[PDB]
Write a protein that holds these residues in place. Sequence first.
Motif, PDB file in Angstrom:
ATOM      1  N   UNK A  87      -5.380   2.350   2.841  1.00  0.00           N
ATOM      2  CA  UNK A  87      -5.952   1.285   4.363  1.00  0.00           C
ATOM      3  C   UNK A  87      -5.903   0.175   3.598  1.00  0.00           C
ATOM      4  N   UNK A  88      -6.168  -0.476   2.761  1.00  0.00           N
ATOM      5  CA  UNK A  88      -6.258  -1.416   2.319  1.00  0.00           C
ATOM      6  C   UNK A  88      -4.461  -2.639   2.086  1.00  0.00           C
ATOM      7  N   UNK A  89      -3.831  -1.413   1.971  1.00  0.00           N
ATOM      8  CA  UNK A  89      -2.683  -1.784   2.054  1.00  0.00           C
ATOM      9  C   UNK A  89      -1.875  -1.560   3.172  1.00  0.00           C
ATOM     10  N   UNK A  90      -2.683  -1.350   4.711  1.00  0.00           N
ATOM     11  CA  UNK A  90      -1.684  -1.664   6.099  1.00  0.00           C
ATOM     12  C   UNK A  90      -2.731  -2.996   6.082  1.00  0.00           C
ATOM     13  N   UNK A  91      -3.801  -2.841   5.820  1.00  0.00           N
ATOM     14  CA  UNK A  91      -4.891  -4.392   5.706  1.00  0.00           C
ATOM     15  C   UNK A  91      -4.221  -5.885   5.543  1.00  0.00           C
ATOM     16  N   UNK A  92      -3.857  -5.085   4.142  1.00  0.00           N
ATOM     17  CA  UNK A  92      -3.670  -6.506   3.745  1.00  0.00           C
ATOM     18  C   UNK A  92      -1.696  -7.222   3.472  1.00  0.00           C
ATOM     19  N   UNK A  93      -1.237  -6.394   4.425  1.00  0.00           N
ATOM     20  CA  UNK A  93       0.050  -6.508   4.659  1.00  0.00           C
ATOM     21  C   UNK A  93       0.971  -6.344   5.637  1.00  0.00           C
ATOM     22  N   UNK A  94       0.598  -4.850   6.567  1.00  0.00           N
ATOM     23  CA  UNK A  94       1.192  -4.807   7.544  1.00  0.00           C
ATOM     24  C   UNK A  94       0.696  -5.506   8.680  1.00  0.00           C
ATOM     25  N   UNK A  95      -0.591  -5.582   8.601  1.00  0.00           N
ATOM     26  CA  UNK A  95      -1.869  -6.641   9.810  1.00  0.00           C
ATOM     27  C   UNK A  95      -1.470  -7.853  10.110  1.00  0.00           C
ATOM     28  N   UNK A  96      -1.046  -8.183   8.882  1.00  0.00           N
ATOM     29  CA  UNK A  96      -0.910  -9.782   7.962  1.00  0.00           C
ATOM     30  C   UNK A  96      -0.004 -10.212   9.340  1.00  0.00           C
ATOM     31  N   UNK A  97       1.471  -9.059   8.634  1.00  0.00           N
ATOM     32  CA  UNK A  97       2.143  -9.976   8.754  1.00  0.00           C
ATOM     33  C   UNK A  97       2.943  -9.941  10.574  1.00  0.00           C
ATOM     34  N   UNK A  98       2.364  -8.695  10.801  1.00  0.00           N
ATOM     35  CA  UNK A  98       2.787  -8.586  12.473  1.00  0.00           C
ATOM     36  C   UNK A  98       2.030  -9.398  13.438  1.00  0.00           C
ATOM     37  N   UNK A  99       0.652  -9.541  13.080  1.00  0.00           N
ATOM     38  CA  UNK A  99      -0.663 -10.741  13.373  1.00  0.00           C
ATOM     39  C   UNK A  99       0.692 -12.502  13.172  1.00  0.00           C
ATOM     40  N   UNK A 100       1.402 -12.062  12.629  1.00  0.00           N
ATOM     41  CA  UNK A 100       2.041 -13.733  12.643  1.00  0.00           C
ATOM     42  C   UNK A 100       2.960 -13.446  13.364  1.00  0.00           C
ATOM     43  N   UNK A 101       3.762 -12.339  13.039  1.00  0.00           N
ATOM     44  CA  UNK A 101       4.862 -12.323  14.267  1.00  0.00           C
ATOM     45  C   UNK A 101       4.581 -12.717  15.867  1.00  0.00           C
ATOM     46  N   UNK A 102       3.210 -11.413  15.957  1.00  0.00           N
ATOM     47  CA  UNK A 102       3.234 -12.218  17.237  1.00  0.00           C
ATOM     48  C   UNK A 102       2.451 -13.286  17.864  1.00  0.00           C
ATOM     49  N   UNK A 103       1.976 -13.921  17.400  1.00  0.00           N
ATOM     50  CA  UNK A 103       1.395 -15.419  17.478  1.00  0.00           C
ATOM     51  C   UNK A 103       2.957 -16.435  17.726  1.00  0.00           C
ATOM     52  N   UNK A 104       3.947 -16.117  16.755  1.00  0.00           N
ATOM     53  CA  UNK A 104       5.272 -16.602  17.126  1.00  0.00           C
ATOM     54  C   UNK A 104       5.618 -16.238  18.418  1.00  0.00           C
ATOM     55  N   UNK A 105       5.365 -15.107  18.669  1.00  0.00           N
ATOM     56  CA  UNK A 105       6.352 -14.698  19.697  1.00  0.00           C
ATOM     57  C   UNK A 105       5.664 -14.776  21.136  1.00  0.00           C
ATOM     58  N   UNK A 106       4.391 -14.553  20.923  1.00  0.00           N
ATOM     59  CA  UNK A 106       3.129 -15.120  22.068  1.00  0.00           C
ATOM     60  C   UNK A 106       2.380 -16.323  22.893  1.00  0.00           C
ATOM     61  N   UNK A 107       2.885 -17.555  21.717  1.00  0.00           N
ATOM     62  CA  UNK A 107       2.210 -18.776  21.682  1.00  0.00           C
ATOM     63  C   UNK A 107       2.126 -19.578  22.931  1.00  0.00           C
ATOM     64  N   UNK A 108       3.034 -19.015  23.612  1.00  0.00           N
ATOM     65  CA  UNK A 108       2.825 -19.652  25.181  1.00  0.00           C
ATOM     66  C   UNK A 108       1.366 -18.873  26.275  1.00  0.00           C
ATOM     67  N   UNK A 109       0.630 -17.540  25.462  1.00  0.00           N
ATOM     68  CA  UNK A 109       0.317 -17.431  26.767  1.00  0.00           C
ATOM     69  C   UNK A 109      -0.703 -17.016  25.354  1.00  0.00           C
TER      70      UNK A 109
END
Lengths: 273, 222, 213, 98, 10
Positions: A155-177
Amino acid sequence: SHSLRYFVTAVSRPGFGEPRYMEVGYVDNTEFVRFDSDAENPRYEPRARWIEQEGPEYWERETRRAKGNEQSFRVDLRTALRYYNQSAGGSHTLQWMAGCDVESDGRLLRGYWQFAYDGCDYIALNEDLKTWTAADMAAQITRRKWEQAGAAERDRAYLEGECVEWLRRYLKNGNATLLRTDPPKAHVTHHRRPEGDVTLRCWALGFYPADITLTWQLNGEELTQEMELVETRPAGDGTFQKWASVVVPLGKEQKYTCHVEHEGLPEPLTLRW
Amino acid sequence: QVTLKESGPGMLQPSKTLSLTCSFSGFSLSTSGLVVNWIRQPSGKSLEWLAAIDWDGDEYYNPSPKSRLTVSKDTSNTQVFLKITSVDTVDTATYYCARSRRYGRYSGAFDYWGLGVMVTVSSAETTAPSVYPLAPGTALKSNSMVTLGCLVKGYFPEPVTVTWNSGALSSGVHTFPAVLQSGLYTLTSSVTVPSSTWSSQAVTCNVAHPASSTKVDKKIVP
Amino acid sequence: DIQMTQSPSSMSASLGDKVTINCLASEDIGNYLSWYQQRPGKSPKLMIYGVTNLEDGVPSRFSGSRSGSDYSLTINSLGYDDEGIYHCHEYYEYPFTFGSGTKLEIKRADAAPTVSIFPPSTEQLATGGASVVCLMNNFYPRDISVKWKIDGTERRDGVLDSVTDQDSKDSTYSMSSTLSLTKADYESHNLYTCEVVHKTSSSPVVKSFNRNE
Amino acid sequence: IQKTPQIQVYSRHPPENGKPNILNCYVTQFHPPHIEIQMLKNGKKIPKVEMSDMSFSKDWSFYILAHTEFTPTETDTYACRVKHASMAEPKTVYWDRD
Amino acid sequence: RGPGRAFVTI
């Protein structure tokens, strides 16, 4: 800071059919993905504009994971029905919160991974992402078995790795809204009353995000009277509204100033009647 | 436990008002998502859903019975009443009450059912049965086994009992279902008996009608 | 109303045989259907909810399926404990429509009906009316038809029939036909005969009596 | 083990008569998540009650938003009726241009 | 992406 959050609801429906399984995804406070098990061909649908540019592989793997978690919640519901010595004909609910709050730079500030049964807190993963807090006598069996299996580590491996980088990608892709700041249109309404005084109403409409401060002041002071304000509500299009009332005497309505402070404003707005 | 019980008066005259009650002890129509629905079934036909009432107090009806239905709950969540105005002879049936759970906007199957209350609508009043013997053909040959009959005509209430030789003869007997006729019921009861015992002994037909408090005997003779 | 048609109207199977009962909805009742079982002389208890979910306590030999708009309920290892009447449900639109109901009995070796004629008792004649009855006992299956010939004509008016359910002794049927006539009409003729024909006799089994004997 | 729902009925855009608007019912903080929300015009149930995601907050109580198209007039009264499990009687709340 | 349960019963 920004957060990637996922909310899961599993509700047994005995005498009605299979339990309803729901999975909603939020960035900050905006929904962008949704899954519902009782709808036809249950698949991951987009709920925002910026997530629609994901390939069919994205939705395929997310639907696979959603259905796997759905079966997991089925067996979890049955096991909880056995744990609490409850009736098979009742309808019970499992709720699952999982996500990551991260600072605006790139450091996970909080990892959330918690479960509640029928509205009461069942189990939680502490901020250390290693120790489990179990509230019920039956939740301790879950804690012990999950320490044996070692679910906290993955669970920590998910939270500390996949969650943060997919949040980064979502922020870079959804910076308009997701990074937009729409200022609120504000005004004051003056209604006389059948008593003898006047109700002043300050309105803030059409803003983003929901973080807003709305207060009234008497003579520049923190005001000493019955102020009634309601909670921030959505408009159904991405914006929110708010209003704060105050009962004032007839003739002194010009003494009261409504101050609205938003994160999308250059200066706090002050309004008089 | 659940256990819900129907209570209601059987034998009603037409154009009157039928009032049934359903008493349940296992759940409550209080701050509970449960709803209670009335179902009726005419003997030998299909089930018909009549009405339903949520724990709110909200009522739902079947538009098929024009506007003669009214379902209502108690101020004490433990009973549910149904009232049918201007009852007709077509409303003779057995009535059940069933439980369902409210899932948002829809209802969802009947978990537990009551036992059922039989109500019958007919203008005829209670009468006593007339019993008649049924002897073999006047020109019958020496068969191995013979069959004797007992015909019960002209009684109103649905239940009657038939025994043979005060219940001693019980092997090979056949009690037929009752049939109505212009308000009064009639049925038949047959008995098979070896030609060695008949007519070497006396074979009696013992009819019993409880609602009229009658016991009748007959002796079948050629 | 979303009237729902259930079929077949009546089914009969051997011990251990798999049987299927179908149900159709005129409109789209997607997974909003349940199957209820009612034992002889009991209230319908719930069996399958949703469409394929057995209620807790139901033997696993039962199954519920759906194919487009026709719902099926299958049972593979049939026993004597399952004979009864089965019903469909609809809980979608508020006028909840039910199925017609399907009766499930157990098969047995075919039997021939034993028919008997019963001349009216003098008392009946004394009253003023007259009823001739000719019972048929211990046959199988339910299909059977009677005629009643009064001196060669039919006179199929004034007759009443009453067929029982399967006997608790060996699952055989019984029928009783009563021709209720006036005393004047009963004295009008002499020979009276019953013509019952079963799926076994190929030729009508006939029984009769003569008044002047 | 149940939480009573909170209701807010309101218009999306500043309401004025004859102008089309979206009226919505915002129902928060309830449990279990089996509720029914009906929109009433002059007492009659509107069928266009399109509702949004039945999500829940950190307190584990659920929330939902149910909106419909309408046109505000000075003669039409609009309300939202909620039927839950925790309230013995359904809660009706009338719209009011605060 | 969302979280995976890995079919671990509570």
